[model samples]
Target: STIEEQAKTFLDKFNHEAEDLFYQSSLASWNYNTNITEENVQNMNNAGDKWSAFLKEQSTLAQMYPLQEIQNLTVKLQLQALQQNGSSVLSEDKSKRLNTILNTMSTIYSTGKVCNPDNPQECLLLEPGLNEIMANSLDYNERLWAWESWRSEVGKQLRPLYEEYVVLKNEMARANHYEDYGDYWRGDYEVNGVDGYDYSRGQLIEDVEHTFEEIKPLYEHLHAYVRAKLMNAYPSYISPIGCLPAHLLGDMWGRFWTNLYSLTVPFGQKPNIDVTDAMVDQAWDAQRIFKEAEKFFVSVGLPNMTQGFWENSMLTDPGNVQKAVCHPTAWDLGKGDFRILMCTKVTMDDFLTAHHEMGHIQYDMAYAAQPFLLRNGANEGFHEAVGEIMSLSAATPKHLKSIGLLSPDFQEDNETEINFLLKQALTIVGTLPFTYMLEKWRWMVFKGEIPKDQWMKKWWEMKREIVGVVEPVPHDETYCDPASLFHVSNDYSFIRYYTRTLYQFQFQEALCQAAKHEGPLHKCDISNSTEAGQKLFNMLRLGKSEPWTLALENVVGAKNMNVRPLLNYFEPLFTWLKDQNKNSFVGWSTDWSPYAD
Candidate 1:
């Protein structure tokens, strides 16, 4: 009784202090991301250092009480959360240094820009400038300029800091008894060796690799189809059997090929349901897009966005102000505060992203009742999947028509179905291997398998082999290509995106079933289904109170992440792609590798 009472007192104090520090750190992060000023960056760094110190200090106290002796499930979990504070396992000074490197790298990426050679005064920010060039430009030289300039200007500057970062992060992981930094990130999923369950870190790797194999066939079909279209567009620059040039794959990072839909559409003459032109024609702006997303949540029996959310969120670019990070993100500051940071556009891509970000807010609101440590998704992937599940329904033609984005006469015939699935696959299916490869590279890098001199070589090698994507030019130690991505620059885990792709489809299938839909999985929209909303909300409310497996089982009737739903949803599109690529190359060769020289 004495020991249990003491444990409760220690946990109570720890929770209160931890929540205060977390709030401060989150607000500082929000301030820096919204306005990338020197002062704000330092403030964010200081706040992070303070939080890291508090976690490290409490970690020893957390282990003083045996978990088996604690009768309260909630308190025991909270204590465990303290003990698993990944990067904070370093000494106070080391933690502070890590914070500085991370913040400085993020600031460099946010402020980096490229100037046009023809006009000395013309410069371009990454978001609207280089991003648009990669998306809309068919000019080979121009796309090459934007892609090359970004890596040289932004990524090159991060090289030294990134090398330093790897050392400190790995040290922190070793302090916490993890093999490497990648292992530390994996622990967020709550896979423990002690649980009676069979789950372990090794199992995670096996599962992820297995899922990638399950979905690889669909990806290769889409890849071949897109490559053929790109070869036609860039006649002299592309080859039929080689991997795609990264810069030509749609966006800055080739993470999503959605922008290439026009070039790759199966039937060009058909009336594609493009809302971007309609959005501009009807005077829809970024604010209107977010409002519509909020209404969708309410229609599905979820709460509306708070007034603070509207007041605080940066839904669009604040032109002519201090520089800011334009990468889209959802924030859950402690208490009931929630917000999104994005330099949104009125395109169909952003319209779907609006629903995706708002899905995060809904989940945050659902779990607001949990204790500080427990106020998270069952796992990191669950949060991402929650957001994507909303986008799945929102992107449906049925939902688009109900919202007047499509005409009442718009019909989904066989041709339109193929076109629609192709477009969705470009964004959803196209990104699977990209996520897998990036994280795989990072995992190997952290484990010391990727030497400094070989980082770029190995990076492009995996990109070519696994993603069927290639670098346009040779890269060396001077370039940190991975850090060019927003997630890598900001130090977020990548595998969540890969895992969430599968989970979102699984969640969508279950919700559609609850709504009593009778149609193709992709065509079913659960917009007005309270039954679907309640099923989702129930699992969300569980937060991290139970293992992620149990929470997953609660919603989708499964204990493991399965790719069947994802494969089933894309069955129609996969068959069509195979038929189209029947005469063309269905895979890639590394003959075009720049390293071959």
Candidate 2:
């Protein structure tokens, strides 16, 4: 039985089985209402663990094939596979603790409900439902209560276990030749050839630190505007220059200031454009609104959502028979199948979110021709950046006007642009430090550089220094605010979002230039342009087949992740924001003296 054909047959069989399990596990997570129990979680990990062990063998064999590139790539994917299998060294009891914690965390975040203090009899605090309230509701107390509720339930309660999880995960990574688990997690980013570096952990931190510096000023401007305005309105609630209430802003962590939309937007200032209202005024709903966004693709010579997409996708929450994971996600179910699982809501924010999710689906669709091993993003940031670029066009004043959403005159108004920038600043701009700090905190903790007792104080100090946010409510050293962020507890990376924040601007300009877009770079909307879509397709089709920088070079015309493109795009908006709030206090309290005792 020394036949080469027989060995090839066995390898092919193994690969197919691995792909099948991968697909099944992905499907289960997205279809949580019908699937995703403890049995399912174990099943998912079992499949991944099985695949990881097999892939290790394949990687070793691939190296023996006398081909260097295949060996290199397989080794890279092998590292990612290990992480996916929850590669950790833990006692049997803690291993069980990890599984239980993951399940409990998912249920608390996805399906658990809290009650409104003011209207407990009639109200329930559904996870993102509270986020909805915080962003739109004027009731400060309710917002505070909602913010506190989720944090206390998931974050505060999970506080000890989360640190425990971090310690174990980091230990596994250190044993695997990486400095820390954070480094091990990011090891996929190291390009083997480009930039002549080993893609070291130091390089990753350097890149993040560099961008953090670049975007720090923008957040400073935002901190100034937000602190000045909100301080006057709720002076007693916040400190002289401490943290802003997470609830008063839009999201759980003040990542996006949905509540500030009305505040920052000049009163009675009807946008010159109104695409969302234009479609909705005709009584459109979520599905149609999504399709309407999809029309942008057809105009650009890309395919529309497949029939399979609509059939397989879960757009709405299941009824009271079961709970669902309502957070929007696009599942790439391998083998040319894809679908979206979203808890659809009739809001412009949700519309933008749908556009974002579809951007991911479209990226998946573009790479459908690739082998299963090749069908991934250049990196997480690139995948996320693609969505933001799509949203850029959707958010554009001109795009809005063309769709009959705004008065055509909006193109001429500076306030419209200012309004646009303010909202984005709240998200992409404001959260740079937060995204950076979270990783920095975790990285530090993983390295054991900071003593455990100093963690909370260090966390507070970083917030004040970087984001200019202070801790408004009293929380003790025992508390765990970082766990409140899904990324920290859920074991996903946060730097990608920050990286995406920078990369989205650079990418938009790159795609715009390819589409031959002119005028101010910020105003360019490459929607419906084949030049743009073609350029995007060229990059998308590459998948993770090449080093990320090579793919980035083709898209952005540069191999570097520089900040100049971002600063260039947002220049006018920054100026306008600065001038708008120049006379008032721009940053809250910059000094940590008043905080983190």
Candidate 3:
């Protein structure tokens, strides 16, 4: 009873402090981004250091109260909080350095684009510019240049420092008794003979292992198709997938296999529904599109966007010198304080991104009734998957029709349906191994498995072995290329994204069943059912108060993160794609990488 009292008192104060710290940090970030001011960075740095110190203090508090009445509410809360922060018990100096390194990465990313008037056409790449040309251009050198230039930026000259950054991370994990950072990462999924969560971590990894193994057979089939189509796209390099300058078989660090959608995009089937074209066809702008997005939640029986949200959200361009973050994100300061940060543009990706961003809002709104500690998702992946679940619905022909995005009479033709399945395959499935392999490579680095001299060589070797992507340009060890990509340098976790992609289908299937829709699972609409909203919120309200299995059980009637559910959802599409591939080359051409090997 005394432990409970101590826990409650500490947590109420602790959690309240957390809210203010998080809000201030986020505000600083928003300000730093909008204005690119050093003062903002200082503000963010100050807040972040405080946050780190507070977490250390709290985690220490958990350790002090160690003889926790095991499952006592106070004990459970601290234990759970400690479980996450427990490993992060770094000293104040180390915490400050970690903050500085991350901020340095952010500063690097912020300076991504460069102007070269001498070669204006070649140098004009928005940061991370590979997608623009890789997806849209036919010029071989131009695509290569875009890929190389964007990665080799002023901000990312931190390649020499990457090894240091990696070692520090390893030490951080080592402090928690992990063998290496990868094991430390995978350790979060460790089990205690429990059936209650993905915390039975080994089973889920074993399943993910097999799931990805199966995914390779299908991907090899797509790789062959991309090679046949891009034989000409790689004219300058004269190499194709399995040994390309790159992605003449769709490999961008193998993490984003997006260009395959373009590489194999039939000139005839240029996406019968292109978002940019669709948005342009209508005189749609950002404001109208977001309103269109808002309607989906209304239809789903979620509360309308509170007036506070709309008023606070920096929706459109403020007609200012420095533009808002072109990347859209939903921000929650508190229940009534729901807001989004978007530099609204009028394109299909933009429209859909708005819908995706709102998914974050919906999850936050649904759980607002809970206390701060309980307000978060069961896992980081759960938070990411929430918006994606809604985004998938936005693509459904029925919702698109109901929302006036797709015309009603456009009865599904075989070709259009084929594109639908193939595009999903290209992204959700195609990128799975890539995302997995990235962390796989990073894990090895963190473990010191890669010798310092072999950094670039071993990096590409793994890319080849795991993802079948070979370098187009020979890379030497003067600069850090991977660090140029924000996720690695900024310390954003990639595993959640991979898990989220797999989990979304499971979530969609469960929601479909809840709405009791009898048609194609793809066509199921839970957007209008109060029952569906209630079922979803029932899981949401529990927050992280219980095991994730409890939430999974509440929604899917099972506690396992089994992705067999994914195959069940996409089997028909796979069948259709397999049939589509018989006439084409269906395996890698003399590759060393093997799915099982």
Highest lDDT model number: 1
lDDT of 3 at 339: 84
lDDT string for model 3 (307-340, tens) is: 8888878776554365343446688876257888
- List, in order, the clash count of every candidate structure: 0, 13, 6
Encode model 1's per-residue lDDT on 308-343: one tens digit a residue: 999999998887777788888888986678899988
Estimate the overall C-alpha local distance difference test score of candidate 2: 0.68
Provide TM-scores for the models: 0.96, 0.88, 0.88
Tell me model 1's lDDT, rounded to 2 decimals.
Answer: 0.84
TM-score of 1: 0.96
**Displacement of the residue 249 alpha carbon in candidate 1, Å:** 0.6
lDDT (Cα, 0-100) at 567 in candidate 2: 82
After superposing all C-alphas onto the true structure, candidate 1 shows an RMSD in angstroms of 1.8
Q: List where candidate 1 sits over 4 angstroms from the true fold.
A: 84-88, 193-198, 593-597
lDDT of 2 at 40: 61
